[PDB]
Amino acid sequence: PVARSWVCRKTYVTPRRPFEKSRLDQELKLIGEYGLRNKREVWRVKFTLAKIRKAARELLTLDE
Amino acid sequence: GISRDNWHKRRKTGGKRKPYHKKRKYELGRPAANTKIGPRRIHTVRVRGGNKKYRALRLDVGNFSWGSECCTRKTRIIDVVYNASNNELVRTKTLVKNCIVLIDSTPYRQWYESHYALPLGRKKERKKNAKISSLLEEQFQQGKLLACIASRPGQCGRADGYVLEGKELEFYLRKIKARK
Amino acid sequence: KLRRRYNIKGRQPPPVQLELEDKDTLKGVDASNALVLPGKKKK
Amino acid sequence: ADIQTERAYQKQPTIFQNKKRVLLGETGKEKLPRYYKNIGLGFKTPKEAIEGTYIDKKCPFTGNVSIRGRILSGVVTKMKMQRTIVIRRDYLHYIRKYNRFEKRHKNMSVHLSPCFRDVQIGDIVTVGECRPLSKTVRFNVLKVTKAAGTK
Amino acid sequence: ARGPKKHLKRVAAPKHWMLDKLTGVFAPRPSTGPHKLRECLPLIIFLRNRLKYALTGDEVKKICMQRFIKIDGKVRTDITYPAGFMDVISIDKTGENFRLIYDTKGRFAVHRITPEEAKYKLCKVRKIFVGTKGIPHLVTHDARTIRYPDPLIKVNDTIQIDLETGKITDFIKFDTGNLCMVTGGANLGRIGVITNRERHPGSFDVVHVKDANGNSFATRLSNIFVIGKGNKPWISLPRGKGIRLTIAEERDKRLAAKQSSG
RNA sequence: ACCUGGUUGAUCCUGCCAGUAGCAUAUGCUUGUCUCAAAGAUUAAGCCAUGCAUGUCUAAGUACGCACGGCCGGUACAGUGAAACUGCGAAUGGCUCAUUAAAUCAGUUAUGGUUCCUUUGGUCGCUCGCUCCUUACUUGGAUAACUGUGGUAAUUCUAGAGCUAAUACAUGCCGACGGGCGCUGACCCCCGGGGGGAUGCGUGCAUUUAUCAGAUCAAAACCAACCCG
RNA sequence: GUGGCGGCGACGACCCAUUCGAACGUCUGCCCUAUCAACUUUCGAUGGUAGUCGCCGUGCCUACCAUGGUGACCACGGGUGACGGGGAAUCAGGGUUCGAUUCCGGAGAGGGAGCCUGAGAAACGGCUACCACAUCCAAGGAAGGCAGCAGGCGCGCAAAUUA
RNA sequence: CCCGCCCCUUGCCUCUCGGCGCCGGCCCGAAGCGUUUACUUUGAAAAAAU
Ligand SMILES: [Mg+2]
Ligand SMILES: [Mg+2]
Ligand SMILES: [Mg+2]
Ligand SMILES: [Mg+2]
Ligand SMILES: [Mg+2]
Ligand SMILES: [Mg+2]
Ligand SMILES: [Mg+2]
Ligand SMILES: [Mg+2]
Ligand SMILES: [Mg+2]
Ligand SMILES: [Mg+2]
Ligand SMILES: [Mg+2]
Ligand SMILES: [Mg+2]
Ligand SMILES: [Mg+2]
Ligand SMILES: [Mg+2]
Ligand SMILES: [Mg+2]
Ligand SMILES: [Mg+2]
Ligand SMILES: [Mg+2]
Ligand SMILES: [Mg+2]
Ligand SMILES: [Mg+2]
Ligand SMILES: [Mg+2]
Ligand SMILES: [Mg+2]
Ligand SMILES: [Mg+2]
């Protein structure tokens, strides 16, 4: 028994298809326009937006 | 040592089980009190919770009740005549609950003579009723009464009971006669 | 457990007369708890 | 018949039967007073228990037992032991993986009081929980109703 | 275990104590006392977590050993004393009196009471029996035993007890139409009127209650404490009057207030 | 035609191959700043040097160690206090997963079939009854610390002798006075009130056995018309 | 006057209730194996009567009686790199695979047995004997149990601080 | 073709309580009995942590 917390989570997921020209081009455009450091910064925001839009879709499955 | 647990027994279906723990203190058993007839010898036993049990090893007196006359008197114990559980206890003269014993009849005769002012045991508003069965008169002639022990000497340390009367007396007399 | 384990080895004269005082020491005496044992241990 | 079939005298413990009386009361009738009780929960004491002469310390009506706990039902399957029978309870157990059922059963040994007579194999019995009366017996028979098909 | 346990893990403590997770491994195990372990509020929790008079357990000990805190009119120096439902806590140094009453969230509330109200408490009768020499005895929910009670008092009734003398002043009978509070289950802390009672022999009775807003609910007979005769309670009530409010009707009252403003 | 590519004159079947993402075990090269968390595993629940992990005193059980100390002839004991006796705890916590398949465990129900240190609330008074005459203002026997004599290669080993305590261990009653305390009341005296009283009824449990009573049992109030006096 | 009355606390104490439990029972629910089909019953297996022991109910045990009790709705036997659960991962779902591991319950203290004290232990940082290990010795005897926290070993090959 | 108002609904003896009824048996009044469950929709009671 300890008085510590073990709660943590990951904030990004690596892409499903690693060799896609469209994905690489989109990442290049985003990183260049917003001055980001690497691909992980894009993947983090993509993870957040995926969570939000999944929640919205699940709510839209219900009655008004 | 002695254990009175359940998990050494077979199952209802007939299969056997394997233990998952060792013997526990609260499952213990202790050797019996084979209470004999003789000068009083009683030991105390410390039991679970801190209480006491009187483990009577040897007894010679007890108070018995004449129920029909409502006369409770302390009397010595003479012999053991019948035991329903086992005949070996009769042979070894062991005092247990529900065994049939022979007791002296002197205090009961004294109370009867001092109460009704009639003779009993002698050789050849409502008034008080003095009527005795023929079997009890014969026993008073012999000087010894048949009694049944109602207490557990190995647990309470004393041997009390009641004088056999009525159909119970006839039943036990028939059993004793058939045993011989 | 039919399988073979590692720790196999680790898991496989009249007495002297006594006249003691009135208080009893025989409360816990049994086969494994003997009141008196010979002074010289067997070699 | 005769109730004294054991080596010890069979007697109902709470009744004193050696009271002396005038000969006028002796001449009339030697009828012992019976002990019985109401077990509660709407179950009625059978007539033969009140009017009988059997001695049973495990009888729910004339013995020293208390009914408390669960009240169950069963079908009588075997009557071959002394004062105790074997009943069967059938049920359906549901398996979620296949979304279906299977038939299962349980066997119970229950104490039958001598007050219940003309009990056959195949009739419904209502039993109640009591203290353990033997190694495997924990329920005691409260009510008997006959099979619907057999009259 | 080979005997009684003496510790309590913090995450295994009752949830209505509102203890956090990172303060420590342990929680105060209540002492044995008038109330059960799972239905009590220890003195340390009330004195440092609810009122913030102390910062640590040592300061709670220092406060208690000055004989400042009185529970039901008697000074208690044990910091893990189990204080329960309808208990009176007095601190004369700060001029404060409290009564332990559940709120609508199922937790003991900081409920301040007038000093005249601090002289009595309500108790639920748990047992009636005849003791030695034919003297009637009454046993309440907080382990108080009282001799020579009124013959009209039966089990599940409520009595008012004067704290100074420990004697019954009057009583409320258990009947339909009386006011009651729920002391356990899902409806804990809800106040209403008894409507009818369902009896199950050899089992638990079920009682139906309706509050002031017309909502109906049901509990077991052991979870009901009669508070008042008719609709009038015999004690002061906390900020919520025992009505558990839903989100929809909270929105409704907010809309009504917004419409009435302007 | 249920991913993309391969194994046929055409259409198929059966064995197959490669690519794509993770989990576990072991292991490399690199590692400027900061926050949080983790740490098992030879079927070896195999073996362990050393140290530590459980002790505890309030005004309130027992101080004749000057061990230290104020006041003194009132002088049983000022006060602090090591040691030892007594009381309580040491059955909680921490570690591990070897055994265990209706067993453990989970939900549900029962104690009217048992025990329970503590906490909290109750309870915790005596008429007389051959113990006579002038311990209940307090009864009895011991033992540690301490002093001294010792034994052994060696341990938190202990032997003989001499003192002294109790909330340790035992025993044991209620000292004298008063109508003992309550009810119940024939008569009587005074002023609806006060009194004195012939009399009657009561005045520990716990244990073991037997018997009796226990809702065909007790206790009380209410009562029109109609009688009864 | 070996007068009569007393206030506030501490400790102790028989019993009743309360609290914290503990222990026995009720109902329902477990993985693989039928090339395990009948099992239990002398030496208790199922039930009855009386008793012993036990804190208590009970074949828990002992005498005397009956011949029962379980089973293809899978008993009984065998296996498990089988402590159980709350839970973790992955899924459209259904499920499948993990759960020694900080919460709850059980069990053990190198191995099988026994016991004292106590309200509570079959206790091991308590005791007694046996088996296996192992320390000191003047050889007579004596003392032991890290699956507590650190730390060392487990052929020569190796991973947290004796704070 | 609505809306009032009254009436019949038979029975049976497994259990229980009864009988002033007949030869242990039988008759009778009942105060006795005269369907149950699965399914579905509720309501209680059901540790935290995750
Ligand atoms: Mg533990
Ligand atoms: Mg505590
Ligand atoms: Mg091919
Ligand atoms: Mg003190
Ligand atoms: Mg000590
Ligand atoms: Mg204590
Ligand atoms: Mg202790
Ligand atoms: Mg008390
Ligand atoms: Mg003492
Ligand atoms: Mg007395
Ligand atoms: Mg018996
Ligand atoms: Mg038997
Ligand atoms: Mg295993
Ligand atoms: Mg686990
Ligand atoms: Mg253990
Ligand atoms: Mg080891
Ligand atoms: Mg103790
Ligand atoms: Mg042990
Ligand atoms: Mg150790
Ligand atoms: Mg330990
Ligand atoms: Mg270590
Ligand atoms: Mg190594």
Swiss-Prot record, chain A:
Cell location: Cytoplasm; Nucleus, Nucleolus
Domain of life: Eukaryota
Function, as annotated: Component of the small ribosomal subunit. The ribosome is a large ribonucleoprotein complex responsible for the synthesis of proteins in the cell. Part of the small subunit (SSU) processome, first precursor of the small eukaryotic ribosomal subunit. During the assembly of the SSU processome in the nucleolus, many ribosome biogenesis factors, an RNA chaperone and ribosomal proteins associate with the nascent pre-rRNA and work in concert to generate RNA folding, modifications, rearrangements and cleavage as well as targeted degradation of pre-ribosomal RNA by the RNA exosome.
Family assignment from sequence similarity: Belongs to the universal ribosomal protein uS4 family.
Assembly: Component of the small ribosomal subunit. Identified in a IGF2BP1-dependent mRNP granule complex containing untranslated mRNAs. Part of the small subunit (SSU) processome, composed of more than 70 proteins and the RNA chaperone small nucleolar RNA (snoRNA) U3.
Protein name: Small ribosomal subunit protein uS4
Native organism taxonomy: Eukaryota, Metazoa, Chordata, Craniata, Vertebrata
Gene (name only): RPS9
From Swiss-Prot, chain B:
PTM sites of type N6-acetyllysine: 36
Localization per Swiss-Prot or TrEMBL: Cytoplasm; Membrane; Nucleus, Nucleolus
Gene3D superfamilies xrefs: 3.10.290.70, Ribosomal protein S8e, subdomain
Homology family: Belongs to the eukaryotic ribosomal protein eS8 family.
InterPro entries in alphabetical order: Ribosomal_eS8, Ribosomal_eS8_CS, Ribosomal_protein_eS8_euk, Ribosomal_Se8/biogenesis_NSA2
Modified residues (Phosphoserine): 134
Source organism: Homo sapiens
Statement: the UniProt record of this protein carries the keyword Lipoprotein: yes
Protein name per its UniProtKB record: Small ribosomal subunit protein eS8
Curated annotation (Swiss-Prot), chain D:
Keyword Ribosomal protein: yes
Modified residues (N-acetylalanine): 1
Maturation and modification: Citrullinated by PADI4.
One GO molecular-function entry: RNA binding
Modified residues (Citrulline): 21
Omega-N-methylarginine, modified sites: 68
The organism of origin for this protein: Homo sapiens
Modified residues (Phosphoserine): 66, 109
SUBUNIT field: Component of the small ribosomal subunit. Part of the small subunit (SSU) processome, composed of more than 70 proteins and the RNA chaperone small nucleolar RNA (snoRNA) U3.
Sequence positions bearing N6-acetyllysine: 37, 44, 57
Keyword match Cytoplasm: yes
Membrane-spanning residues: none
Alphabetical keyword list: Acetylation, Citrullination, Cytoplasm, Lipoprotein, Methylation, Nucleus, Palmitate, Phosphoprotein, Ribonucleoprotein, Ribosomal protein, RNA-binding, rRNA-binding
Taxonomy of the source species: Eukaryota, Metazoa, Chordata, Craniata, Vertebrata
Localisation per UniProt entry: Cytoplasm; Nucleus, Nucleolus
InterPro entries, per database record: NA-bd_OB-fold, Ribosomal_uS17, Ribosomal_uS17_arc/euk, Ribosomal_uS17_CS, Ribosomal_uS17_N
Protein's name according to its UniProt entry: Small ribosomal subunit protein uS17
Biological role: Component of the small ribosomal subunit. The ribosome is a large ribonucleoprotein complex responsible for the synthesis of proteins in the cell. Part of the small subunit (SSU) processome, first precursor of the small eukaryotic ribosomal subunit. During the assembly of the SSU processome in the nucleolus, many ribosome biogenesis factors, an RNA chaperone and ribosomal proteins associate with the nascent pre-rRNA and work in concert to generate RNA folding, modifications, rearrangements and cleavage as well as targeted degradation of pre-ribosomal RNA by the RNA exosome.
Pfam family, one: Ribosomal_S17
UniProtKB/Swiss-Prot annotation, chain E:
SMART domains for the chain: S4
Keyword Ubl conjugation: yes
GO terms, biological process: cytoplasmic translation; positive regulation of cell population proliferation; positive regulation of translation; ribosomal small subunit biogenesis; translation
Positions where N6-acetyllysine occurs in the chain: 232
Keyword S-adenosyl-L-methionine attributed: no
A GO term from the CC aspect: focal adhesion
Cross-linked sites for Glycyl lysine isopeptide (Lys-Gly) (interchain with G-Cter in SUMO2): 229
Start and end residues of each S4 RNA-binding domain: 41-103
CDD domains per the UniProt record, alphabetical: KOW_RPS4, S4
Primary location group: cytoplasm
PANTHER family: 30S/40S RIBOSOMAL PROTEIN S4, SMALL RIBOSOMAL SUBUNIT PROTEIN ES4
Function: Component of the small ribosomal subunit. The ribosome is a large ribonucleoprotein complex responsible for the synthesis of proteins in the cell. Part of the small subunit (SSU) processome, first precursor of the small eukaryotic ribosomal subunit. During the assembly of the SSU processome in the nucleolus, many ribosome biogenesis factors, an RNA chaperone and ribosomal proteins associate with the nascent pre-rRNA and work in concert to generate RNA folding, modifications, rearrangements and cleavage as well as targeted degradation of pre-ribosomal RNA by the RNA exosome.
Protein name stated in the entry: Small ribosomal subunit protein eS4, X isoform
Organism: Homo sapiens (Human)
